[PDB]
Amino acid sequence: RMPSKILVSLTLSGLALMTTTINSLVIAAIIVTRKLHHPANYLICSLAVTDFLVAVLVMPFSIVYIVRESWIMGQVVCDIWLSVDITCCTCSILHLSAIALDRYRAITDAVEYARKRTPKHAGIMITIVWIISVFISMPPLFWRHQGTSRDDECIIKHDHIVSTIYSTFGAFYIPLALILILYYKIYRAAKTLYHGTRERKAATTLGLILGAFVICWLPFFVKELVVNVCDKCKISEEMSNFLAWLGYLNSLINPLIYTIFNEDFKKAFQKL
Amino acid sequence: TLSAEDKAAVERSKMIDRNLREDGEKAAREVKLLLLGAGESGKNTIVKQMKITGIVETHFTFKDLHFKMFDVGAQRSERKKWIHCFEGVTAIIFCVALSDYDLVLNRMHASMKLFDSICNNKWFTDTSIILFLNKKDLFEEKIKKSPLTICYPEYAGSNTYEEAAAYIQCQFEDLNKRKDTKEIYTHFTCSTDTKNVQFVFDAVTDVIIKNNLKDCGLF
Amino acid sequence: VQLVESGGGLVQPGGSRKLSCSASGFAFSSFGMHWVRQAPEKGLEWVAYISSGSGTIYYADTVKGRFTISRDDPKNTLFLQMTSLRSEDTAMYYCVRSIYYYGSSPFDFWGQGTTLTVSSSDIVMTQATSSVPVTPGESVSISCRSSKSLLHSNGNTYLYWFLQRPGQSPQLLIYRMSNLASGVPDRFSGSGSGTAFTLTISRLEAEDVGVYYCMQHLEYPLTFGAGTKLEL
Amino acid sequence: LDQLRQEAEQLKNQIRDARKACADATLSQITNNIDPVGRIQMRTRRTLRGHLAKIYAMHWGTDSRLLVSASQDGKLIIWDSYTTNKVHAIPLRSSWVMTCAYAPSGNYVACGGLDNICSIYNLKTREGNVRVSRELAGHTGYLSCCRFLDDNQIVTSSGDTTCALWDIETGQQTTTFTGHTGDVMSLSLAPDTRLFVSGACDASAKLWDVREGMCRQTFTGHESDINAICFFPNGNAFATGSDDATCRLFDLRADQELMTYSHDNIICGITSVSFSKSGRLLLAGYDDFNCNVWDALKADRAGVLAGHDNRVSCLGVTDDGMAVATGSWDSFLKIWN
Amino acid sequence: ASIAQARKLVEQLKMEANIDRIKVSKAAADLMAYCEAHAKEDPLLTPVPASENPFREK
Ligand SMILES: CN1CCC(C(=O)c2cccc(NC(=O)c3c(F)cc(F)cc3F)n2)CC1
């Protein structure tokens, strides 16, 4: 009886704890080290902060949900958990998009964009990312209308096509199209600079930085579209939460794909 | 715990720190360049051309980009103990005159040795080297007067300006023992007014692009 | 080094004025400024203090709100906007130069002063005698006491001694009670202990006649003694 | 002409024979008896941050509380070792500084480098802001070390193989010291101010007379360039550092190689050498990103100072011996005690 | 040209030839005596009490 659920509980709790620790060490390295204290890393710092917030707020709640299907905490916190999860996921996606935009700007206008690459620019970019993550995630609050708290279930069934279509496109696909276009342009610039022993390394780095996000979010996100827009059937709840945790895994992967292929971060991590 | 004006001293320290940080941020954007070469390699003439007893500093402003050029040719002292201070130089301008074969005390061998010494120096592994080959206008007829065999015995190609310059720049580039870590630019500048500035700007922007790609993880 | 302040005259009670102090001959952009006022027949009284770059500003409890202090580094001028005046505010106003750091000499320079007449927990400084006769070639000891010990935990004693010749601006004689101020004749020699301090003069001569002001700088508001006038 | 070479060789051989004659016993034999000094534990009491460039030189004031650091950022910063407050930030006309020193009187501070000019700054100006008093130029090589002989006169070492004593008010080199085969890098002043010793890339240390204006004594034995040199507190001996990863102590009276400090696992060069107040502890900076404490008598590794992420370029012990500062190319200064 | 340099070098060596000369044992004894005499007043050699040390904990 106990071991079957206990193994899952432990392998989820340890994953969440290690994600939190990896985010914390990244934040400590960024704040502590002066060599890394330049505005190019402020977007990554914001991304790490969002990942830490996810791991400390929503992931443990999802773990207690999966281990025990009853939302014992009550509806009083279901709404705030939903809001935090939704806004933090959107904020992480938009932070990856903004990091891609900063890199593209720095590789296309390295002599012009350098002057405008001040801490103020990073701060305003982060604020706009949060503002978009707030504007998005608002339509899904239709759960407030026609509530189903008696079901003892904290997930949301929305039942409205165009609204979820917008909150879907603008939440991940528009960021997806943006990041693909920008990384394609960056790869073109790198190819034009190279012209391939290192070109292979650059291609591997791009493949990692893109495929991590793609594998993390595309499956769960397309499931959430197909099930909620037109499909009359539904995917198994256990499978759906597996895709949700796969998406959450992006928080752990980001520190292991960002800041790992950087000499400054490699040197800084030894200090901690 | 602090006394009445101990807090004032702390505030003054914070003000000084803020001013120093502002000055450092302003200076960081400025590009730093090192000018090396022989005295007769046209260093003075060339540095005067593109201008828009110890080390000499010059400031340029081209397309909203600030430059810092350091001339240390006049410093007649042993190297390998003061050159390391230039570890942060974005790029090194190595000026060599194509017309210095006829003088023997032979300057071509000295210039090649100097290029080998600095380019392969452990402090300049990641730095980019720009080779500004001057005196092309009079080299045009100096090559005709005497062959490259006077200085390069292994030379066997046609004694033509286009082939001679190509062989010279290939030989200069061959000295680099690390091809991947650094790239050596080559250009013929003297007898021109804006092409040298354009080439310097292209080299520096390429270096910045490479640095951005490297700290982005693509190098 | 020169300090020029102006903006005096006759002000009716409850009126307003804009005093100014011009800074020249020194790096005013980094030096702090203090305002100390002397009544027509009384001692000094601290008014306001503005730190370097306007980072920190202080006012005395008896002048808080009534006056506001501002500075303009590009113009090398110090401003003191003042309003709601009363008869108690009639007093000479002095522009004071000070820089705060280890080994520095705060309050080392004082302005000529401007005459502004109004139409009709703080540390208390105590002095032994109001006036003491003196003779050339003799030695005179002036004792000053503070309500609380001026010896801070760092080991420095925060005592400042100032001399004002009749009709001239005061100048700093002894700072920290142990170090001689720059340009002093070197005759003076300060000493003291916890809550007890004294000023010793060796071979008093001409130009030493005046009133000696005792000051404390351990905690704001800054306070001044009643003064001790040496008479020949 | 060959007669001069033969005479020089004979004189050198006679000098070596004289050195050997008085080498009755080595310092190790006599110092083996004294009890060893236990592992000296030190911690970074203060981390004086604020520099955005490499640190090359520093000096402790006679008050044993204030110190000045020279960096390539173009700023000279005077620090309060107890409170870490920034006393001053002097903007240098030339950012390529290589050495700096604090006047014993505390009213002056000087620095120099590739600019070939010894700048003298006033720290007690009536104007309020620190300004250059007089630019003591004249050297034809980059400055490598500057030390204040007195409040009104200084001694400078440059890369032109010459050490010059400069008069502040006059603005001219009153005395010139020559005789080094290579560029002279480091220089130390004796406690009595009567003698000073300098080292050059010629692998030899020269002792000069402050007032006589003539060479007094020469030392050899280093296998590579000399980088650091400092007087023993008694003033009758001095330790010299070289790029050959060895530190050697020479006594002026003994006038011969007294003791050499080296370890198998040390291959980097030495950039700075300083002595403790009692002279029992020898502190030398190394390019392996840490400083090692050497017992001046037993020549044992008494301790290791670490924490810098780059080469340590400068270090000095307070006149009272309370703490020793360390500076490295990472723009960080650490005080140890 | 080299005549002057050779003359200066030989003169310097000759001047250095006639100088003071003592045994190394005397220098070692003097260094040991200096180290032992001032050992008690070297804070680095022996840790001093935290109260006397100005570099106390923050
Ligand atoms: C468990 N949790 C689910 C979504 C989280 C996420 O990444 C995310 C981010 C932005 C928008 C969004 N959309 C919805 O949640 C949604 C929905 F679940 C039903 C609808 F009917 C409509 C919707 F919009 N989801 C990840 C994990």
CA distances, B87 to each of A110, D102, D329 (Å):
22, 28, 11
Helix, coil or strand: residue D257: strand
| Contact by Cβ (8 Å): A160, A168 | no
For strands D75-80 and D86-91, give the pairing.
antiparallel
Q: Round to whole Å and give the CA distance between A254 and A211.
A: 11
A89 CB under 6 A from ligand 1?
A: yes
Q: How far apart are CA C172 and CA A71, in angstroms?
A: 76
C129 within domain boundaries: yes
Distance CA B111, CA B132 (A): 13
Q: Reported resolution in A?
A: 3.4
Q: Any CB–CB contact under 8 A between D151 and chain A?
A: no
Which of E15, E28, E43 lies closest to D322 in CB terms?
A: E43
Q: Which residue of B has its CA nearest to C49?
A: B8
- Alpha carbons A248 and A92: distance in angstroms, whole number: 10
Encoding tokens for residue A78?
Answer: 């279901």
Residue A5: how many CB atoms within 10 A of its CB?
Answer: 12
Q: Is residue C232 part of a domain?
A: no
Instruction: Identify the helix (H) or strand (E) that includes residue C134.
Output: none
Q: For residues C165 and C162, what is the distance between their CA atoms, to the nearest angstrom?
A: 10
> Closest Cα of chain D to C101: distance in Å?
6
All structural domains of chain D with their residue ranges? 1-336
Q: Report the distance separating Cα B72 and Cα B33, nearest Å.
A: 11
Answer yes or no: are the C-beta atoms of C170 and C213 closer than 8 Å: yes
Q: Whose C-alpha lies nearest to ligand 1, atom 27?
A: A244
Are the Cβ atoms of D126 and C27 closer than 8 angstroms?
no
Provide the sign of the torsion angle of the four alpha carbons D94, D98, D103, D106, taken in this order. Answer: positive
8 Å CB contact between D285 and D244: no
Q: Which amino acid is at D78?
A: I
Quick one: chain E helix, strand, coil %, rounded to 5? 55, 0, 45
To the question of whether residue A85 is assigned a binding role by annotation, the answer is: yes
Bridge partners (DSSP) listed for residue D109: D102, D121
Contact D56, D271 (CB under 8 A): no
Atom 18 of ligand 1: nearest residue by CA position = A156
Which phi and psi angles does D145 have, rounded to 5°? -160, 135
The whole-angstrom separation of Cα D281 and Cα E46 is: 11
Q: E45 with D278: CB under 8 angstroms? A: yes
Q: A40–B219: do the CB atoms touch at under 8 Å? A: no
| Closest Cα in chain B, distance from residue C216 (Å) | 10
Question: Is the minimum distance from the CB of A224 to ligand 1 under 6 angstroms?
Answer: yes
CATH of domain B27-213: 3.40.50.300
Burial of B183 (0-12, 13-18, 19+ CB in 10 A): middle
Alpha carbon separation from D335 to B96, C80, D72, D84, D192 (Å, rounded): 47, 44, 21, 10, 27
Touch between chain D and chain C: 3 or more Cβ pairs under 8 Å: yes
For A231-259, give the secondary structure using H, E and C.
CCCCCCHHHHHHHHHHHHHHHHHHHHHCC
Is A39 close to ligand 1, i.e. is its CB under 6 Å away? no
Phi/psi zone of residue D74: left (φ > 0), alpha (ψ -120 to 50 degrees), beta? left
Q: How far is the CA of C4 from the centre of ligand 1 (A)?
A: 70
Closest CA to B34 of B4, B67, B77, B76: B67
Bin C203: left if φ > 0, else alpha if -120 < ψ < 50, else beta. left
Q: Are residues C125 and C113 in the same domain?
A: no
For every residue of C174-190, DSSP letters joined together read: EETTTEEPTT--S-EEE
List phi, psi (to 5°) of E37: -65, -40
Collapsing DSSP states into helix, strand and coil, what is residue B128?
strand
Q: Among the residues of chain D, which ranges form H helices?
A: 2-21, 27-31
Q: Closest approach of chain D CAs to the CA of A267, in angstroms?
A: 9
**Residue A102 contacts by C-beta under 8 Å, 6 or more apart in sequence?**
A40, A43, A117, A122, A125
Residues 6+ apart with CB under 8 A from C58: C48, C49, C220, C221
Q: What three-state secondary structure class fits B182?
A: coil
A226 touches chain B (CB under 8 A): no
Q: Contact partners of A by the rule of 3+ C-beta pairs under 8 A? A: B, D
Instruction: Map C46-98 to HEC letters.
Output: EEEEECHHHCCEEECCCCCCCEEEEEECCCCEEEEEEECCCHHHCEEEEEEEE
Question: B104-113 burial, b if ≥16 CB within 10 A, otherwise e?
Answer: eeebbeebbe
Chains A and C touch (3+ CB pairs under 8 A): no
The number of C-beta contacts closer than 8 angstroms across C and D is 28
Discontinuities in chain A with C to N beyond 2.5 Å fall right after: 195
How far does chain A reach from its first CA to its final CA, in angstroms?
42
Token look-up 């503005």 returns: C50
Mode of pairing for the β-strands spanning C228-231 and D55-60: unpaired
The range of the structural domain enclosing residue C203 comes to: 121-226
Distance (Å, whole) CA A24 – CA D66? 38
Helix (H, G, I), strand (E, B) or coil at C196: strand
Residue range of the domain that includes A186: 1-272
Cα gap C230→C135, rounded to integer Å: 9
Find out whether D73 and D51 touch, Cβ atoms under 8 Å.
Answer: yes
- Residue D254 sits at the vertex; the CA angle it makes with D253 and D256, to the nearest 5 degrees, is 130
Do D269 and D287 contact (CB within 8 A), yes or no?
A: yes
- Type of residue numbered A163: S
The number of folded domains in chain A is 1
Residue closest via CA to ligand 1's atom 15 equals A86
- Touching chains, D (3+ CB pairs < 8 A): A, B, C, E
Q: Which chains touch B (3 or more CB pairs under 8 A)?
A: A, C, D
Residues C99 and C155 in one domain: no
Task: List phi, psi (to 5°) of A63.
Answer: -65, -45
> Rounded to whole angstroms, how far apart are CA atoms D334 and D145?
21
Q: Is residue C231 part of a domain?
A: no
Cα distance from C151 to chain B (closest Cα, Å)? 10
Q: How many residues appear in chain D?
A: 337
Between chains, do A186 and B218 touch, taking CB under 8 Å as contact? Answer: yes
Experimental technique used? cryo-EM
Do A32 and A272 contact (CB within 8 A), yes or no? yes
Q: How many CB atoms lie within 10 A of CB C131?
A: 11
Distance D288 CA to ligand 1 centre (A): 53
CA dihedral D159, D163, D165, D171 (to 10 degrees): -30
Secondary structure (DSSP) of D185-211: EEEEE-TTSSEEEEEETTSEEEEEETT
CA diameter of chain D: 64
Window 47-66 of D: residues touching B by CB (8 A cutoff) are 50, 52-54, 56
Reduced DSSP (H G I as helix, E B as strand, rest coil) percent helix, strand, coil of chain D, to 5: 5, 50, 45
Tell me which chain A residues have a C-beta less than 8 angstroms from the C-beta of D49: 34
* CA-proximal residue: ligand 1, atom 4 (nearest): A86
Q: Does D26 touch chain E (CB under 8 A)?
A: yes
d(C-alpha C150, C-alpha B3), whole Å = 10
| CATH node for D1-336 | 2.130.10.10
Phi and psi at residue C152, to the nearest 5°: -80, 160
Chain B nearest-CA residue for D73: B24
Using only C-alpha atoms, what is the Rg of chain A? Answer: 20
Q: Is residue C128 domain-shared with residue C114, that is, in the same domain?
A: no
Is the CB of A247 within 6 Å of ligand 1? Answer: yes
**Contact of A185 with A100, CB cutoff 8 Å:** no
Cα separation of B75 and B116, whole Å? Answer: 19
Domain count, chain C: 2
Q: What is the SS3 assignment for D330?
A: coil
CA distances for D30 relative to D276, D297, E24, E31, angstroms = 21, 9, 10, 11
DSSP state, residue D35: P
CB-CB contact of D67 with D103 (8 Å): no
Q: How many Cβ atoms from other residues are within 10 Å of residue E58's Cβ?
A: 5
Which residue CA neighbors atom 11 of ligand 1 most closely?
Answer: A86
The pair of three-digit structure tokens given for residue C121, joined into one six-digit string: 């927990």
CB of A228 shorter than 6 A to ligand 1:
yes
Instruction: Domain ranges for chain E, please list them.
Output: 1-58
Check if A90 has its Cβ closer than 6 Å to any atom of ligand 1. yes
DSSP-assigned letters across all residues of chain A: -HHHHHHHHHHHHHHHHHHHHHHHHHHHHHHH-STT-SGGGHHHHHHHHHHHHHHHHTHHHHHHHHHS-S-TT-HHHHHHHHHHHHHHHHHHHHHHHHHHHHHHHHHHSTTTHHHH-SHHHHHHHHHHHHHHHHHTTSGGGGGGSS--GGGT--S-----HHHHHHHHIIIIIHHHHHHHHHHHHHHHHHHHHH--HHHHHHHHHHHHHHHHHHHHHHHHHHHHHHHHHT-SS---HHHHHHHHHHHHHHHHHHHHHTTTS-HHHHHHHHH-
Q: What is d(CA B161, CA B154) in angstroms, rounded to the nearest whole number?
A: 17
With contact defined as 3+ CB pairs under 8 Å, the chains touching E are D
**D165 Cβ contact list (under 8 Å, min separation 6):** D149, D153, D154, D155, D156, D173, D174, D175, D176, D177, D210
Q: Is A244 in the pocket of ligand 1 (CB under 6 A)?
A: yes
Q: How many CB atoms lie within 10 A of CB A183?
A: 17
Neighboring chain C residues of D88 at a CB cutoff of 8 Å: 101
Subunit contact D309:A267, Cβ cutoff 8 A: yes
| C28 membership: H or E segment, kind and range | none
For residue A133 and ligand 1, the question of a CB distance below 6 A is answered with: no
Interface with chain D: mutation pick from E34, E40, E44, highest number of D CBs within 10 Å: E44
Would the CA dihedral through B105, B106, B109, B112 be positive or negative?
positive
Query: Cα–Cα distance between A82 and A90 in angstroms, integer?
Result: 12
Q: Are residues C90 and C158 in the same domain?
A: no
Q: Are C144 and C37 in contact (CB under 8 A)?
A: no
Q: Using the atom order of ligand 1, give the atom closest to the CA of residue A158.
A: 21
B205 in A contact zone (CB under 8 Å): yes
Residues D138, D140: Cα–Cα separation, whole Å: 7
E29: helix, coil or strand? helix
Structure tokens at C127: 């002095």
**Whole-number Å distance between alpha carbons of A114 and D52:** 19
Q: D319: helix, coil or strand?
A: coil
What is the C-alpha separation between B31 and B89, in angstroms, rounded? 8
Q: Which residue has the tokens 């080290």?
A: A33
- The answer as to whether C135 is a domain residue is yes
Q: Which residues pair with A121 in a beta bridge?
A: none
Q: Enumerate the residues of chain D whose CB falls inside 8 A of the CB of residue B6.
A: 83
What sign results for the dihedral spanned by CA atoms B152, B155, B159, B163? negative
Rounded to 5 degrees, what are φ and ψ at C72?
Answer: -130, 95
Backbone angles phi, psi at C54, to 5 degrees: 60, 25
Q: Residue A268's closest chain D neighbor by CA?
A: D309
Residue C187 and residue C139: Cα distance in Å, rounded?
A: 10
User: Shortest CA distance to D282 belongs to which of D332, D272, D290?
Assistant: D272
How many angstroms is it from D36 CA to the middle of ligand 1?
Answer: 71
C127 lies in the same domain as C110: no
Pocket lining: A50 vs ligand 1, CB cutoff 6 Å: no
